[PDB]
Amino acid sequence: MIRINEIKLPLDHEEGALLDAITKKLGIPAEKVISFNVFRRGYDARIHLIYTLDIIVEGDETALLAKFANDPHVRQTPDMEYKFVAKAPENLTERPIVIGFGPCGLFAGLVLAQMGFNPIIVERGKEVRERTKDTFGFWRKRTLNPESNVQFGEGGAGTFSDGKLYSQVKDPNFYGRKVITEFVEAGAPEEILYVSKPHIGTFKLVTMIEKMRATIIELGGEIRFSTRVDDLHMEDGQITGVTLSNGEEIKSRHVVLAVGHSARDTFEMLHERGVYMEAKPFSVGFRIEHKQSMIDEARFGPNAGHPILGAADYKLVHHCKNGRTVYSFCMCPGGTVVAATSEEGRVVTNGMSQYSRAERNANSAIVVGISPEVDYPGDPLAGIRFQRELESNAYKLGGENYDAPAQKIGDFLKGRDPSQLGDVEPSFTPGIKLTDLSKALPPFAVEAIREAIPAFDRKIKGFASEDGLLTGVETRTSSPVCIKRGKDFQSVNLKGFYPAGEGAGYAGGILSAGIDGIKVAEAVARDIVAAMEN
């Protein structure tokens, strides 16, 4: 195929302005174009769309490329097809175990299953429809199920999200593309393959994971929901199995740990058993809300409401006198601050949107880095203890209700702790209790957020508006531990055991966690292949 890039077309171009641009650029008639894909559609945020098209032409394309050698924007389309590194030897009697069915476990298990390894996937949480019952019900009737909530269950933490797929580091093996093609293959909107800043929306995420679960089952994988791993079978730096919370055993010498960074109990057990772990730094802050219209105004203006440009977003970063860095994270256009606790007596904030991104508010976590040996002890589990501390406190300030501590921008900045709501209303649910957020984070984080928000007002007008809403505590932005593994993908002090995903400290989102899943599946495969060789 032939790749043409830097095709500029007005925002409101008619259909097949694309094809016209193919013929204009390659001097070929419509009739020679067998087909084309949109490989990338972006825009310059100052409108004009920017495409990169991959084109199948009839005849000798090799000849056509030659006549354009001197054109930088006419390349040969790279070979982006995912390569299965192996296939399961027919010898196999041992099925690899995968612990957790978030994006990371999802791809470790899908890739293992596609290579005929017949992986067993366990998930402490539930199938996504019952999970949705448990979670929406927590949000409404304040009854929390510690095993089945925003953190735990089918699809892991990705499920109740805006489903943004973030930029990644370099990826010559096209892991990224492999993840998204599977998404699309399972019903995700085709758009996500080429659009800039793609998003899937929580509802689409739900139908998607189901299909993908069916796809792994059909392939010979096994998926056991409401099934929690509570201990590992260890013997001389070698794992040979796992024990379930029900007391059942499963024996295997290949075990992927992809449990997310909320698997605190699991983290405790791993410590108790001597698996190696290091304190990892991370961020904490508050969910902030403004009217989504005030963001549309600051980013677009008249072109606001356009069905392509979508709901506006933003991305902000401030270096405070404090020495700390405040930034915005998981920004959710027209979305909902969500109640993300997985623990009794703890309040946790995060963010979510629907595909349509049509709620009244724009939100995002405004967070600031904290570090082991600066902000808490340096023992491996100390970040966790510090989180639980932050979460217990917010529950408390929130009225032991599962309501969330909240304060208007205006008085948090100023210290006028008491004031009551303006027009920006809380999306957090069960609900919120106005209070003094100064009490909610460490003195240096509050000071940094305090400095950062007006500095943000300068970047987007209204960001420091008095009525804007600050909610809850966002405490779980990345893992407080590194379950270090090294080039082997194996725990540095335990063979057969594969630390993976966000939980391990090796991913930071849906796409990257999925990418890690693939890499891990590939290394479990290779290892098994090398083992089965003779």
Ligand SMILES: Cc1cc2nc3c(=O)[nH]c(=O)nc-3n(C[C@H](O)[C@H](O)[C@H](O)COP(=O)(O)OP(=O)(O)OC[C@H]3O[C@@H](n4cnc5c(N)ncnc54)[C@H](O)[C@@H]3O)c2cc1C
């Ligand atoms: C509300 C919210 C919104 C988000 N929005 C976005 C977004 O727009 N874009 C983005 O890229 N990311 C988003 N994320 C982040 C994201 O979902 C994670 O980074 C990603 O899911 C990590 O995948 P993972 O498989 O490594 O871990 P997880 O997603 O956390 O999956 C871990 C699974 O393992 C299970 N588990 C834990 N312990 C055990 C055990 N002992 N036995 C069996 N199972 C166990 C858990 O229940 C869980 O289901 C969001 C997260 C949240 C909470």
